[PDB]
Each structure stands twice: as structure tokens, then as C-alpha cells.
Amino acid sequence: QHAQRQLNSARFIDDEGESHYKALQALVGLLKDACEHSRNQGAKALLD
Amino acid sequence: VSYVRGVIARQGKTVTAIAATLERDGAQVRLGAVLWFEGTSSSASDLKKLWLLSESPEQTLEHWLSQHHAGGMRALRQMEKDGMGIWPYPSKKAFLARLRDYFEVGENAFTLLNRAAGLKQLNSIDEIFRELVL
Amino acid sequence: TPQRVREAVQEMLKYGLLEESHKPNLYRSALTNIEVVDRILEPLDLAMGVDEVRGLVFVTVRQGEVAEQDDWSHPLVRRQRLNLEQSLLIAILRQHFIAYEQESGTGASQALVAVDELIPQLQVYLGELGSEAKERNRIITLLDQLKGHGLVSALDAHDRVIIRPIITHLANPENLQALVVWLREQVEG
Amino acid sequence: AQQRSERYVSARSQHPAWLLLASRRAPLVLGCLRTLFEEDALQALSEMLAAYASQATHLQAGRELREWIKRRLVVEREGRIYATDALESAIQFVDSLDSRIMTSTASRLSVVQREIENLETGLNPSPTGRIASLRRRIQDLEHELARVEAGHVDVLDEAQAIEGMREVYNLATSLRADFRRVEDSWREADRALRHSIISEHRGEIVDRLLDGQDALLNTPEGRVFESFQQQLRQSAELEVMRERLRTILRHPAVPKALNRPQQRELRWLALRLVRESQAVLQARARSERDVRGFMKTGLAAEHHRVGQLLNDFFNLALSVDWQRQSERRKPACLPPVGVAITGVPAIER
């Protein structure tokens, strides 16, 4: 949720998309980490 | 026009003002209106109107009258640049929109309140529901 | 003391600032008499700040020989202090003013912002209320509070506000740095 | 084949013209905008949206106008609204659904053949081929002259005349297609230059750019437009073209080929072309003047560092509790600026 709030807040900067890309990268990394190990309570709490 | 001219008791240049105050625990709101006639041209298009919504305790009826007496219309619209809790509207549509936004009500609450404020006789149930509530 | 200098000083003290685009004669009179105006304002513990690029002359609290004064206990300052909510709204308005000032050339214009643009960016931080009327009331109240400091104007018939250039001297990099340091201290413990 | 679908989906999501066409209120918006370019925009949009309820107007009018400004369908410079190329593409697509002039004709085929011959002979450097081609064309013209001297003047039939008139109109009306495209090309170059200046801000770059007199904002479309408008200025042929158009428009077959608006458009072609071409160089000059003024102001470094500080503050602001009234009203750290002195309480003294 904190990463999602950062992604929402980073869309108002005029940097030709650099800050938006950096904000999206962390969220995609979190999703990748959750999907990598799909047999844990923490990971299943995200995508299930 | 009839209320302004007292249908005639007042002819020519004249001023009329009305106000109403609502209070709660720790706040206050005032709704007011100022109408005037420049001369003897009694017509619908010659009546000049302004509506006021205020929260500051310094905004009274006599203050509005003094401002009108000193500057007419410009002095009334000048109060928005010298204070904070005052909102003048030279338009009843925007004034009513702001009023309905202030008290979080629908678009028909005040119409219903007006209908049930002078209803003469309690008629049949179908007539009452088909003429007043809806 | 020349009449024009006195008139300009009195007007600036009354309103707090002089803009070239509205009062050019007084601005020119007060711009060419920096030493005289400074000598006049010295006994009152006040100073004059200049900005020739934007055509602006404002009044600030003179920095005395004390480490801390808070600049708000001066007897002649009547406004209240600024809290976190107003600081957040000021930061949003400063970002909008940066955007406006970047894409502008020669000529005179004004920075106009609609409330509907301001609502979601503030929803991001403050949160969300149920109805739309609640959020409209919140934004209108905050903007009314900010009007008292001379940073914005009253709402137009088309639901827009004007951002005053004085904000560029309220959120200059020094004040922003100090605010960021203070807020970082507040957050971490 | 697979990539084409992805490209179509991207165009559907991003391109302003398709978004405008797929919008809910597309017809009325298109009509109002087309009428305009022929506050006030907001007022007229609200007026048109009023008597079309069917299917709070002033709020949604402004919301949709700002939505289109964000999507870059229309551009806002200082307080005015200007059209772009996407709007004209949408208009051209929409208004061609009623009447479209055929291009699978014999006249178009003859034009294509002559143009191909001209290009092929123009790309050939050898002098012998040029001499042979010139001799052949001269001989053919002499043969036609000999035939005509015997009393064999050829005149187009009514159907051929109508076909030729419609094809000439279709070809001539296409010279105005890309006038907004050049300006759109210059605006993005302006934006890119300003961003590069801010992100760099190095004073050496600004000083070097200011010192040189060579014009900035160079784009591929600009050179094509310059080449076009240079040849547009040779009035020795514009006068002949205008006279020939006037001669053509006085023919019995004109009413059956073109209606009144098309005849008007063909009547004032040269004047309108010159007038509209002269209105683009002024836009370019204004853009360059504004860029030079922005560079001379010298506030780019301040913009950069204030942006950095605002980003830091906004990142920090996510870690506080905004749900408590106690924290929302805690005093902050900002000095008093523009102090307005208290009115002396003498009042009446």
C-alpha cells in the first residue's frame, strides 16, 4: 500500500517520466518477489 | 418587486435587505440578500440584487447597508478582498448551489420544505403523496 | 522627506507589497530609494526585499542580533502561524507555479488553477471523504484560509483561483530546506 | 501480424484523435470545436451542451475541456486555445463520410504517369538521355501542332470535363493539410529545449546559445515548409495559376461538378494559401523570441533545486498521520513574508 501511494504521488512530477518509472519499478519488484514464492502466508495475502 | 415597493408605500430610489442566522455548538452562518431600485423605473429588469453567505461575526445587516450607502455595488463586492468569511453572489443559481453544498442535502430538499410551509388542508393520502412529497 | 517616497512607503506598509504590473509609479519610486527606505524601516525592525526579475517589492521582519526570534512575536505582525495542512497546500501551489513559470515567455499573464485539479492531489495525502460536497467544502475552507495570507485570490465565477507571485519568496529554497529538515526531525521520532 | 494488434491497441489508448472519436459526447464537441475555429470556448461549449440533454452542465463542460487540454487534442498557450493536427485529422475523417471524390479514375492515372515520367527523367544525370527525351517531346508536340493545323481541335466531353474539374479540386485542396503539423513540431522542440536547459542548469550552455545568432527549433517539417513557402512566393506563376482558375470556373459544366462552397474554395485559392503561409512564420518567430526570453531570465537552477526540495517534502509527507486533527493543526516552520502592518488604533484621533 505504501508503494502504491508513492506510485500515485509520483505521477504529478514533470521529469519526462523518470520519477514515474522509478516509482513503478519498486512496485513491480514487490509483485515479482511475492509471485516468486507462492507458498507463504505473506505472499498469498497479496495475490489471493 | 411587490415586497420591495410595499404594494405603494415606497417609490423611486429604495433599498431592501433581509437576513437569517443559523447557529450550532461553536459556529454560526448567516444568509442575506440586498435588493435596491435606482429610480422610479419599477420593472423586473431594473431591480438590482445581491446574495450573501457569511460566517464572520463582523458581517451584519447594518454593515451591508452602510457599504451599499457608501459605494453602491462596488463597495459590496469589495468586501471579499478585505475579509475571509464572506461570499457574495450576483446570481441566485450559484448561490443556491453553494448553499446546497454547505448543508449536504439533495437538490429538492428546500423545495419540499417550501411546499410543506403553507399547506392548507391535509387531503387524501394519494393526493398528499402525489402533490407534496413527490 | 520627499512626498513620493513617503507615499510609496505608506502604501507598501499598508498592503505589504508592491507589484509593478499594478502600481508602476510607486514601484519605481520605492525601487530607486533603497537606502532611504531601509533607513526609514530600521527603527521598526522591518526590512524591504526586492525582486527585479518578477517586479516585486515586499516587506519582511528585520533579522536582529539574536540567534532565534521566531519572526512571529514581532508586535506589528497580526496574522497567525502556518500549520502542516496549509504548508502542504502551499507546496502543491508552488509546484503548480513552477509548472506555469517554466512554459511562459515574454508577455503578461496570470497563474490560474481550478479546484477540481487540486482535489485529487490532496486526496492522495489527506485521504478520501464520502460525498463530493465534503471535499469541496474542505478545499474551499483551506483556500479561504490561505487567502488571508495574500497567497491566492477569491474564487471566480468559473471556479478558479489566481496564485500570487509572492509565493515564490515564501517557498524559496532556503525556507524549503529548513522546512524539510524540521519535518524530517519530526517524522523520525 | 501480432504486432499490428498491439500497435492498434496502443493507438486506441494514447492517440488523441481516436479518443475524441470514441468519446461519449463526440458529435457535439466536434461540431462546437469546428464552428469555433472558423472562457468563450467554455461558454459556447456549455451553451451547445445545454439543449442536448436527451441521452451541473458548466462543471462537466470545464472538466471535459481540461480533459482534452490534458490529452493534447487542443493547446492552451497563455489564455487562448489553439487547434492541433489530431483535431483536423478527426474532422477530415468525419466529414468525408458524406461525400468522397473518387481517385480510381482515368485522369488520376494520366497524372500519375506524367509525374512518374517527370521524376524519372529528373533523376538521370546522363546528358545523352536528356537530349533524346527533349527531342522526342519536341517531335511529339510538333506532330500535335501539325494535326491541329488541319482542323482537329480536341475538346473534352461533359463527363471528362466533370472528372477533370473534380480531380483538380481534390488535388488543389490538399495543399493546406500540414499547416498545423509544422507548429506542433515546433512546440515539442521548444519543450525539449527547455527541459534540457533546466536539467543540465549549466550557464555555459545558455551563454553559448544566446551568443550565437543561428536559429534554434529546427525540425524536419520546418525545412519542408520553408522549401514550400519559398516557391509559393514566385508570383510570376501564381498570377498565371489564378487567371487559369478564373478561366476554368467560367464553364457550363461547373454547376454539375462542384457546389457553391467548392467553387468558393477554388476561387480564392492563391490568396488564402499566401495568407495562411504568412501566419506560420510569425508563430515560429514568436516561439523563438519566447525561448530567448526564457533563457535570458536565468531562473533555471532555482527551478531545478526547488523541484528537488518539493520532491523531498512530498516524499516525507507520506509518513505522517493526516487522520488526526492534532497533527493537521500543529504549527509549521515558515517565516512571515509580505507582512501587512496592523492598522493603528487611533481610528478617530
mmCIF file of all heavy atoms in Angstrom, chain D residues 35-51, unseen atoms left out:
data_model
loop_
_atom_site.group_PDB
_atom_site.id
_atom_site.type_symbol
_atom_site.label_atom_id
_atom_site.label_comp_id
_atom_site.label_asym_id
_atom_site.label_seq_id
_atom_site.Cartn_x
_atom_site.Cartn_y
_atom_site.Cartn_z
ATOM 1 N N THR D 35 -16.969 24.771 -35.355
ATOM 2 C CA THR D 35 -17.563 26.094 -35.511
ATOM 3 C C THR D 35 -16.666 27.176 -34.923
ATOM 4 O O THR D 35 -16.556 28.272 -35.484
ATOM 5 C CB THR D 35 -18.946 26.139 -34.860
ATOM 6 O OG1 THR D 35 -18.866 25.630 -33.524
ATOM 7 C CG2 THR D 35 -19.940 25.316 -35.662
ATOM 8 N N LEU D 36 -16.018 26.888 -33.791
ATOM 9 C CA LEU D 36 -15.176 27.889 -33.142
ATOM 10 C C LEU D 36 -14.017 28.306 -34.039
ATOM 11 O O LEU D 36 -13.802 29.500 -34.279
ATOM 12 C CB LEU D 36 -14.659 27.355 -31.806
ATOM 13 C CG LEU D 36 -15.682 27.299 -30.672
ATOM 14 C CD1 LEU D 36 -15.045 26.783 -29.394
ATOM 15 C CD2 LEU D 36 -16.297 28.669 -30.450
ATOM 16 N N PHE D 37 -13.263 27.336 -34.555
ATOM 17 C CA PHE D 37 -12.092 27.624 -35.382
ATOM 18 C C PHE D 37 -12.502 27.880 -36.835
ATOM 19 O O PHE D 37 -12.029 27.244 -37.776
ATOM 20 C CB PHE D 37 -11.085 26.484 -35.285
ATOM 21 C CG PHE D 37 -10.623 26.199 -33.886
ATOM 22 C CD1 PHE D 37 -11.087 25.089 -33.203
ATOM 23 C CD2 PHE D 37 -9.715 27.032 -33.259
ATOM 24 C CE1 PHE D 37 -10.662 24.820 -31.919
ATOM 25 C CE2 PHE D 37 -9.287 26.768 -31.976
ATOM 26 C CZ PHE D 37 -9.760 25.660 -31.305
ATOM 27 N N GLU D 38 -13.402 28.842 -37.005
ATOM 28 C CA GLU D 38 -13.882 29.214 -38.331
ATOM 29 C C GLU D 38 -13.995 30.728 -38.469
ATOM 30 O O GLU D 38 -13.004 31.414 -38.715
ATOM 31 C CB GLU D 38 -15.232 28.555 -38.616
ATOM 32 N N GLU D 39 -12.518 30.650 -21.832
ATOM 33 C CA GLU D 39 -13.748 31.234 -21.308
ATOM 34 C C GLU D 39 -14.851 31.214 -22.357
ATOM 35 O O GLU D 39 -15.880 30.564 -22.175
ATOM 36 C CB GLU D 39 -13.500 32.666 -20.834
ATOM 37 C CG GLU D 39 -12.418 32.789 -19.779
ATOM 38 C CD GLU D 39 -12.025 34.227 -19.523
ATOM 39 O OE1 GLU D 39 -12.627 35.126 -20.147
ATOM 40 O OE2 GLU D 39 -11.113 34.459 -18.702
ATOM 41 N N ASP D 40 -14.627 31.939 -23.457
ATOM 42 C CA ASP D 40 -15.591 31.933 -24.553
ATOM 43 C C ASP D 40 -15.783 30.533 -25.112
ATOM 44 O O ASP D 40 -16.907 30.151 -25.458
ATOM 45 C CB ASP D 40 -15.140 32.889 -25.654
ATOM 46 C CG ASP D 40 -14.950 34.301 -25.153
ATOM 47 O OD1 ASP D 40 -14.022 34.524 -24.348
ATOM 48 O OD2 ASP D 40 -15.728 35.187 -25.561
ATOM 49 N N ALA D 41 -14.703 29.758 -25.207
ATOM 50 C CA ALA D 41 -14.835 28.354 -25.576
ATOM 51 C C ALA D 41 -15.687 27.607 -24.560
ATOM 52 O O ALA D 41 -16.580 26.839 -24.935
ATOM 53 C CB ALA D 41 -13.456 27.709 -25.699
ATOM 54 N N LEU D 42 -15.439 27.838 -23.269
ATOM 55 C CA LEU D 42 -16.239 27.198 -22.230
ATOM 56 C C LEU D 42 -17.695 27.642 -22.301
ATOM 57 O O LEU D 42 -18.609 26.819 -22.156
ATOM 58 C CB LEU D 42 -15.651 27.509 -20.855
ATOM 59 C CG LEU D 42 -15.175 26.316 -20.029
ATOM 60 C CD1 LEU D 42 -14.497 26.787 -18.756
ATOM 61 C CD2 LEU D 42 -16.342 25.400 -19.710
ATOM 62 N N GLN D 43 -17.930 28.934 -22.534
ATOM 63 C CA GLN D 43 -19.297 29.440 -22.599
ATOM 64 C C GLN D 43 -20.051 28.835 -23.776
ATOM 65 O O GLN D 43 -21.193 28.385 -23.627
ATOM 66 C CB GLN D 43 -19.287 30.965 -22.692
ATOM 67 C CG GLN D 43 -20.510 31.626 -22.081
ATOM 68 C CD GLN D 43 -20.580 31.433 -20.577
ATOM 69 O OE1 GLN D 43 -19.583 31.587 -19.873
ATOM 70 N NE2 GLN D 43 -21.761 31.087 -20.081
ATOM 71 N N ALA D 44 -19.426 28.809 -24.955
ATOM 72 C CA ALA D 44 -20.079 28.239 -26.130
ATOM 73 C C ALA D 44 -20.294 26.739 -25.973
ATOM 74 O O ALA D 44 -21.329 26.207 -26.394
ATOM 75 C CB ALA D 44 -19.262 28.538 -27.384
ATOM 76 N N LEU D 45 -19.326 26.038 -25.377
ATOM 77 C CA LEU D 45 -19.493 24.610 -25.139
ATOM 78 C C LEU D 45 -20.659 24.347 -24.198
ATOM 79 O O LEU D 45 -21.453 23.429 -24.427
ATOM 80 C CB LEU D 45 -18.201 24.019 -24.577
ATOM 81 C CG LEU D 45 -18.218 22.520 -24.272
ATOM 82 C CD1 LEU D 45 -18.566 21.730 -25.521
ATOM 83 C CD2 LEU D 45 -16.880 22.071 -23.710
ATOM 84 N N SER D 46 -20.781 25.147 -23.136
ATOM 85 C CA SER D 46 -21.914 25.000 -22.228
ATOM 86 C C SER D 46 -23.230 25.305 -22.932
ATOM 87 O O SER D 46 -24.229 24.602 -22.729
ATOM 88 C CB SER D 46 -21.731 25.905 -21.011
ATOM 89 O OG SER D 46 -21.581 27.258 -21.402
ATOM 90 N N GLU D 47 -23.254 26.349 -23.765
ATOM 91 C CA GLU D 47 -24.473 26.684 -24.494
ATOM 92 C C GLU D 47 -24.905 25.540 -25.403
ATOM 93 O O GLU D 47 -26.090 25.195 -25.457
ATOM 94 C CB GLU D 47 -24.268 27.959 -25.309
ATOM 95 C CG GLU D 47 -24.082 29.217 -24.481
ATOM 96 C CD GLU D 47 -23.645 30.400 -25.322
ATOM 97 O OE1 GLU D 47 -23.708 30.299 -26.564
ATOM 98 O OE2 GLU D 47 -23.232 31.428 -24.743
ATOM 99 N N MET D 48 -23.957 24.945 -26.131
ATOM 100 C CA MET D 48 -24.308 23.833 -27.009
ATOM 101 C C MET D 48 -24.725 22.604 -26.209
ATOM 102 O O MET D 48 -25.689 21.921 -26.572
ATOM 103 C CB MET D 48 -23.144 23.503 -27.943
ATOM 104 C CG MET D 48 -23.444 22.377 -28.919
ATOM 105 S SD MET D 48 -22.442 22.434 -30.414
ATOM 106 C CE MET D 48 -22.992 23.978 -31.132
ATOM 107 N N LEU D 49 -24.022 22.311 -25.112
ATOM 108 C CA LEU D 49 -24.360 21.158 -24.288
ATOM 109 C C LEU D 49 -25.686 21.336 -23.560
ATOM 110 O O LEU D 49 -26.270 20.345 -23.110
ATOM 111 C CB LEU D 49 -23.232 20.895 -23.287
ATOM 112 C CG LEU D 49 -23.326 19.691 -22.345
ATOM 113 C CD1 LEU D 49 -23.572 18.411 -23.122
ATOM 114 C CD2 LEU D 49 -22.067 19.571 -21.501
ATOM 115 N N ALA D 50 -26.171 22.573 -23.441
ATOM 116 C CA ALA D 50 -27.434 22.815 -22.751
ATOM 117 C C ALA D 50 -28.591 22.103 -23.443
ATOM 118 O O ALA D 50 -29.193 21.179 -22.883
ATOM 119 C CB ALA D 50 -27.700 24.318 -22.663
ATOM 120 N N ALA D 51 -28.909 22.508 -24.669
ATOM 121 C CA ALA D 51 -30.069 21.950 -25.363
ATOM 122 C C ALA D 51 -29.716 20.675 -26.122
ATOM 123 O O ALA D 51 -30.039 20.512 -27.297
ATOM 124 C CB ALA D 51 -30.661 22.995 -26.299
#
